[PDB]
Amino acid sequence: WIARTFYDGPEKNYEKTMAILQIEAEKAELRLKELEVRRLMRARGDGPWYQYPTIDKALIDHSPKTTPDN
Amino acid sequence: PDSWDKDVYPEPPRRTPAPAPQTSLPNPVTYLTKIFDLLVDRPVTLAREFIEQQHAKNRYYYYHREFRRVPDITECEEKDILCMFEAEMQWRRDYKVDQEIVNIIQERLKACQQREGESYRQNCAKELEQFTQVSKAFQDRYSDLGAHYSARKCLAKQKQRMLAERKAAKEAAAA
Ligand SMILES: CCCCCCCCCCCCCCCCC[C@@H](O)O[C@H](CO[C@H](O)CCCCCCCCCCCCCCC)COP(=O)(O)OCC[N+](C)(C)C
């Protein structure tokens, strides 16, 4: 009676544990991958991250400058 | 009693002597057992029969749960968490079953020692030998794993034991 009205079967806890373990393992793998990607992006500068501004080339004036040699 | 398997818990045929009175004096033990029977065993038996018939009026069943076999730790990938979870649960169940096997053998040994009397040293050799074998196997499997034991540590211990055995065999063959 106690088992029938207060508890469930073993398979429920078993499969809930499986799902929880899958989620946690995926999160750990993602954390490691994110750290490695951050290291590579900061070292190389070839990714979307750690982009530091340079002078906009639209500010340059392309006209004759009263002197032939610029 | 049918409540347990006679092969799992063996017993000798229990040969008992016959009463051979030598004198005409009536022994008090027999009379005391007769009055004990009349005053105790009959009412207890009647109450038991009443309770048993009440239980027979309401008969229902429960079952032993069967467990499938799953791949063990020896065929799990390094980081495949689901397979290690299943293998760990299976290994823990096997560990419990082995503990109960050792318990059964120990019960056999204790019953033999009590039953044999003054000749237990000679008449309980088989039980002692069985307990020695089972204890050796259990010690090889599970000793020194620690409180944080796991299937991986048991596999590591077995691998180291097999490496030592292989080295010793190669050394003895190449002697
Ligand atoms: C002959 C009898 C011998 C045995 C006596 C047994 C005594 C039982 C009392 C002990 C209670 C144990 C505590 C249980 C509380 C937690 C369990 C909880 O999960 O159960 C919930 C049920 O809650 C219970 O109703 C709680 C009972 C607590 C009340 C105790 C009774 C007496 C308290 C006195 C109250 C004040 C009296 C008035 C004074 C003026 C439903 O949760 P649920 O997630 O669905 O379960 C899923 C499993 N399913 C599928 C089977 C449903």
Side-chain angles (χ1 to χ4, degrees):
Chain A
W1 178 77
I2 287 180
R4 177 175 52 250
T5 89
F6 290 120
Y7 302 102
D8 322 85
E11 42 269 336
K12 176 177 215 252
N13 193 69
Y14 202 87
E15 276 137 13
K16 280 178 55 177
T17 308
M18 273 174 96
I20 286 168
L21 284 182
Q22 192 210 48
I23 291 178
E24 301 292 351
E26 256 145 23
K27 277 205 275 209
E29 224 274 299
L30 285 170
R31 289 194 193 100
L32 292 182
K33 186 181 282 187
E34 197 211 311
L35 278 176
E36 188 60 20
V37 162
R38 280 180 61 174
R39 193 195 53 112
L40 287 179
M41 293 225 210
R42 208 192 180 123
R44 292 165 186 170
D46 55 352
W49 302 344
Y50 298 105
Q51 288 304 305
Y52 298 117
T54 56
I55 308 295
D56 188 7
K57 83 182 173 185
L59 288 168
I60 304 180
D61 185 65
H62 298 296
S63 300
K65 303 285 196 326
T66 84
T67 278
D69 318 305
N70 308 316
Chain B
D2 199 42
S3 60
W4 74 82
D5 195 297
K6 291 294 155 24
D7 305 287
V8 181
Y9 311 96
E11 222 159 272
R14 95 209 308 300
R15 44 206 286 261
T16 89
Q22 195 170 359
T23 69
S24 184
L25 273 144
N27 52 359
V29 168
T30 60
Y31 293 163
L32 288 178
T33 73
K34 309 230 208 273
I35 86 166
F36 172 91
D37 187 332
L38 226 35
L39 252 74
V40 191
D41 209 14
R42 292 289 316 250
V44 170
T45 295
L46 300 164
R48 186 56 179 173
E49 306 213 321
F50 170 78
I51 295 168
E52 292 254 50
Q53 96 197 336
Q54 291 302 114
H55 289 171
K57 284 212 217 134
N58 189 352
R59 214 136 191 61
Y60 66 110
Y61 310 88
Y62 85 105
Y63 315 94
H64 169 97
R65 181 180 276 278
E66 324 291 330
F67 271 108
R68 200 176 298 132
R69 301 303 296 172
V70 311
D72 40 321
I73 197 67
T74 54
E75 37 205 34
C76 297
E77 319 218 278
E78 172 122 2
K79 286 309 184 198
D80 190 1
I81 198 54
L82 309 171
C83 300
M84 332 174 45
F85 172 68
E86 302 251 21
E88 181 71 25
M89 295 299 109
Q90 176 160 265
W91 179 85
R92 271 168 160 283
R93 271 178 258 118
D94 292 357
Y95 191 10
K96 281 176 226 123
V97 174
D98 290 346
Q99 291 165 14
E100 292 285 47
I101 286 165
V102 175
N103 284 328
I104 286 170
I105 301 305
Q106 276 169 142
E107 289 172 357
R108 275 191 200 173
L109 185 51
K110 298 184 219 133
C112 187
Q113 203 278 337
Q114 169 58 28
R115 183 198 310 111
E116 284 324 298
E118 307 267 29
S119 50
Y120 68 93
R121 184 54 73 203
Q122 186 192 8
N123 292 147
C124 289
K126 259 304 295 315
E127 275 87 359
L128 178 59
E129 216 264 301
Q130 272 179 6
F131 178 59
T132 309
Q133 289 158 0
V134 177
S135 206
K136 192 41 154 123
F138 192 93
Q139 200 182 80
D140 277 345
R141 281 191 182 203
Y142 303 112
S143 277
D144 307 323
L145 289 193
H148 300 286
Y149 51 68
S150 56
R152 291 179 46 208
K153 294 181 179 180
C154 195
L155 176 59
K157 185 189 180 187
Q158 165 165 355
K159 270 176 179 274
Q160 150 196 284
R161 179 154 49 73
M162 304 198 279
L163 282 185
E165 273 170 8
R166 177 180 82 172
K167 165 147 120 47
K170 182 250 290 177
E171 197 271 332

